[PDB]
C-alpha cells in the first residue's frame, strides 16, 4: 500500500555531511507513527545493510557500528517522512541508501528481512 521515496543522494566531498529524505504515500488509514523505519545501503560490491532504524513504540534508535555517534536517523510524522543525517562521511559510505518500512516493531539493529516496505533507492557518492 505505502510508497516510499527516497531524496537527497548526491556527490558529497569526504568529511563532509549530507541529509536524505524518504516520503511515504498511500495507506491514508494508517497513522505514520504506527510504522517502524529504516535506512539500509548497498555499497558497490556489498550486499544490503543495515545503517539505521526507529522503533514505532517508545521511538528507540538502533545504529550499525560504522556510523554510531556519525548518523542521526528522525522522522516528520506531519510530513510522513524519515530523515537521515550523515556526518564525517568517508569514501566507504558510497552506496545506493534504501528507506523501509514495516507496521511491526524490532528491538535491537533490524535486518532488511524485518521491513514489508522499500524505496527505489538514491544514490550517495563521496569523493
Known amino acids: 500500500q505505502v510508497q516510499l521515496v527516497e531524496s537527497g543522494g548526491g556527490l558529497v566531498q569526504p568529511g563532509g555531511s549530507l541529509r536524505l529524505s524518504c516520503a511515504a504515500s498511500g495507506g491514508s488509514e494508517y497513522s505514520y507513527s504506527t510504522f517502524s523505519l529504516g535506512w539500509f545501503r548497498q555499497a558497490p560490491g556489498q550486499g544490503l545493510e543495515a545503517v539505521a532504524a526507529?522503533?514505532?513504540?517508545?521511538?528507540?534508535?538502533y545504529y550499525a557500528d560504522s556510523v554510531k555517534g556519525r548518523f542521526t536517523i528522525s522522522r516528520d510524522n506531519s510530513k510522513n517522512t524519515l530523515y537521515l543525517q550523515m556526518n564525517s562521511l568517508r569514501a566507504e559510505d558510497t552506496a545506493v541508501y534504501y528507506c523501509?518500512?514495516?507496521?511491526?516493531?524490532?528491538?535491537?539493529?533490524?535486518?532488511?528481512?524485518?521491513?514489508?516496505?522499500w524505496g527505489q533507492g538514491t544514490l550517495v557518492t563521496v569523493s
Open positions: 526507529i522503533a514505532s513504540m517508545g521511538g528507540l534508535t
Open positions: 523501509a518500512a514495516v507496521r511491526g516493531y524490532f528491538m535491537r539493529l533490524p535486518s532488511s528481512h524485518n521491513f514489508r516496505y
